[PDB]
Design a protein around this nucleic acid. Structure first.
Lengths: 96, 380
RNA sequence: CUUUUUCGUGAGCUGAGCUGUGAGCUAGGCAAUAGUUCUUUAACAACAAAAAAGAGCACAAACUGUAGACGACUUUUUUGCCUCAGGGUGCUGUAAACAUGAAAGUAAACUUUACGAUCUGUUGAGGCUUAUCCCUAGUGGUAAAGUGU
RNA sequence: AGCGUACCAACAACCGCAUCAGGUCUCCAAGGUUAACAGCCUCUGGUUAAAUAGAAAAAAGUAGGUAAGGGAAGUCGGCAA
RNA sequence: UUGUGUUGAAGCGAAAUACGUGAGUUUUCGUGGAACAUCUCCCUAGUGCAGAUCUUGGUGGAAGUAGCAACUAUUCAAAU
RNA sequence: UCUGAUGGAGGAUCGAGUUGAUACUGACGUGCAAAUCGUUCAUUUCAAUCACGUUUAGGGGCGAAAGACUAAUCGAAAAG
């Protein structure tokens, strides 16, 4: 049961993807990354994070997203992924 | 009936089958012929493709339209960290071919060399070469005496040191380099002396020497016949597509001949290319390895920003005129010429005036980062 | 098999003695029997049980992309790798905001105030830069340990 | 007085053997740009559904783009663009 | 005419130290559950199949293959 | 006679829609489809287009004429 703050570079994850699949691919990669980092199969993305990823349409999701992962106890373990509004991304490294 | 118009066949049948190479490492099919009169010497080396640059050299070809003018030539950089001699293999001739009499090993081998024997080195307890290295010196001398008595071909096992390169790979590439030179006794003494120390490029090759390069070409997966064999595209009106060979054989013989070009694997082929001239053997020690007498700047071979897709050349290197098969990071086997060349190109003493070190990413205008910052001045 | 014995080799012993082994010498008496043959069960190699003596990797997984339709192939799994960040190298071309700043001109008050494409300064700025670019024992992480022998 | 009055009208309710990219008559007709009931975008209304999805992404196919220098030398023919 | 069947008929599956030259005949075991022969002689016919792009029915290899491609596009969370 | 307006004729012009079908001899050709899909093209005040109703029936009809059409059937329909 831990909380982590990480930046995800979505540009290199959606680099090879079609126009019509950029935002869904970004969402899928965010889920996969959170699952791998937290070692949980149950990953729930916040609707606000979905809104942020889709805010610019399907064509271009944000290049980087600052996100907060949280492990919760209620197979048993699962993780919430939440958007973190930041003015800038420079100097923002992984935190635990 | 006969062809209306004759044209030569597409591609060479001498590089068949166009299948993937068995291995990544370039393998010598045959070493240069042994000359007993010459002193014992190594005949091959292994390095890694770092990248390409261009140089300026003054031509000395009388009667040529270039002659006294200075020309630009493309060159390939092969990072050549010193190899390590770790083994000796004796070969004797039989009607069935060359037969190994025995291979003896040095008293110590590096973990880099041992890694090559493991598919999963991280989770193993690394027990290879741990108890065969305590063999008695008497048995070693017995094996060496029998090799001297019965063998006619001597090869030294030597391995690269990828830790000295930016490669992600940790297991060393190991190969046999045939010792060409004097008698069997002299060959054995020559290898025994350096049975455990480093073998730099300079002891194997001299500047302005022609060598052959053995490597594996750049892979491209399966490619169509148009790209793989260079056949002509069919006209735009062709019903089921135009990127193919129209007729793949006459009615008889009632089969498809092996000479017909077809779709298949392209690239990742083993190739042995002859007559690449060494323009410079750049040492790791000196800080002006990329400098010339006409430049007198202080700069090393690595272009500003690094060698794209390779890294920084921090070791011994050699500058090969022209191109070399393979991607960056590809292991490249340098072999001595099978027979020494006496042509003017092979014997020419190259005098290079400038070695380019601008950024190979984009269109670099500066040779050094210091020159870049000097030109731009202070910024935010 | 016993007796009289001669010569060569192995165990242990100290070039050398003893025991055994093979061949031989003198003398003796001691056996074969299945009804006329039905292959003369006779070799070689292996195996099983019971007795006596000596004696680790690979796959998967995650990573990689020098590879690739899928397999396969090149790699790494704690001086490594992934990640983000910093730096380098480049690409584009000077961000947003502010300015009794400019601006072809216009209108509206008793010399100022409003509109204004566009331009200027802060600003070679801002943005992007590996996803198959380069450097960094910089941040955080590096997971269950399943399958075959 | 008697009879009809639900619903579809195709987008799966009709005819094409079907929940078939086909066929099948009529009326209403917003805003911006504009000559325009054109094209493109939008408001009301409707929809986000189509005999499938995920991943990878090579050959080849199909539907398109762009190509230095030359400019029909291609081809039966400037077919296609 | 003279026989077999619930102490198991016809049919069917596998067979047989079986007989025949052969079409076949006859037996055994198993299954089956109600009929069956007659070669003593004869009468009668819609009486014998490998084929006919044969008829009807059933079933294969192809093959877990071709393929499930118009109509720009889906995503997050919750309920059942 | 000449000039400028006005006027609004025409089996006049371009052009969506409609009605068709020139070319790619494109796709498809075990199709979405026993004639479709895409682009391109022809056509739009008239010999114009559409609906319903109604008439003409097989050696007959109907034909701005191709032996065309007459219910996927036409150098003689379909059913018995």
């Amino acid at each position: 049961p831990v909380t982590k703050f990480i930046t995800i570079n979505l540009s290199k994850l959606t680099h090879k993807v079609c126009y019509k699949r950029k935002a869904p691919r970004a969402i899928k990669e965010i889920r996969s990354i959170a699952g791998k980092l937290m070692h949980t199969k149950d990953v729930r993305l916040d609707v606000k994070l979905n809104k942020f990823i889709w805010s610019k349409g399907v064509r271009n999701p944000p290049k980087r997203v600052r996100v907060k992962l949280e492990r919760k106890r209620n197979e048993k373990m699962y993780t919430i992924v939440e958007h973190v509004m930041v003015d800038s991304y420079k100097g923002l490294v992984n935190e635990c | 009936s006969h062809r209306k118009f004759e044209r030569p066949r597409h591609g060479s049948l001498g590089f068949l089958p166009r299948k993937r190479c068995k291995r990544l490492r370039g393998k010598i099919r045959s070493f240069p012929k042994d000359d007993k009169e010459k002193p014992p010497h190594f005949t091959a080396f292994m390095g890694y493709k770092a990248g390409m640059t261009h140089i300026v050299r003054e031509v000395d070809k009388p009667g040529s339209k270039l002659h006294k003018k200075e020309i630009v030539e493309a060159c390939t950089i092969i990072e050549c960290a010193p190899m390590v001699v770790v083994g000796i293999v004796g070969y004797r001739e039989t009607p069935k071919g060359l037969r190994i009499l025995s291979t003896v090993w040095a008293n110590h081998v590096s973990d880099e060399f041992r890694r090559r024997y493991y598919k999963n080195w991280y989770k193993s307890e690394k027990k290879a070469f741990t108890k065969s290295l305590n063999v008695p010196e008497a048995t070693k001398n017995c094996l060496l005496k029998r090799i001297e008595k019965y063998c006619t071909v001597l090869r030294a096992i030597c391995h690269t040191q990828p830790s000295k390169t930016p490669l992600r790979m940790k297991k060393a590439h190991i190969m046999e380099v045939q010792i060409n030179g004097g008698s069997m006794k002299e060959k054995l003494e020559f290898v025994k002396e350096m049975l455990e120390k480093n073998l730099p490029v300079s002891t194997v090759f001299n500047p302005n020497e022609m060598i052959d390069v053995i490597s594996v070409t750049k892979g491209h997966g399966t490619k169509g016949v148009v790209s793989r064999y260079g056949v002509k595209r069919l006209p735009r009106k062709t019903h089921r597509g135009l990127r193919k060979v129209a007729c793949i054989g006459a009615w008889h013989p009632a089969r498809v001949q092996f000479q017909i070009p077809r779709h298949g694997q392209k690239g990742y082929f083993h190739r042995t290319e002859r007559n690449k001239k060494i323009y410079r053997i750049g040492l790791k020690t000196d800080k002006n390895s990329a400098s010339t007498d006409a430049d007198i700047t202080e700069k090393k071979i690595t272009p500003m920003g690094g060698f794209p897709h390779y890294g920084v050349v921090n070791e011994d290197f050699l500058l090969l005129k022209g191109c070399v098969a393979g991607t960056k990071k590809r292991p490249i086997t340098l072999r001595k010429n099978i027979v020494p060349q006496v042509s003017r190109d092979a014997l020419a003493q190259v005098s290079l005036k400038f070695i380019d070190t601008s950024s190979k990413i984009g269109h670099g205008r500066f040779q050094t980062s210091e020159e870049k910052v000097k030109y731009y001045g202070p910024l935010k």
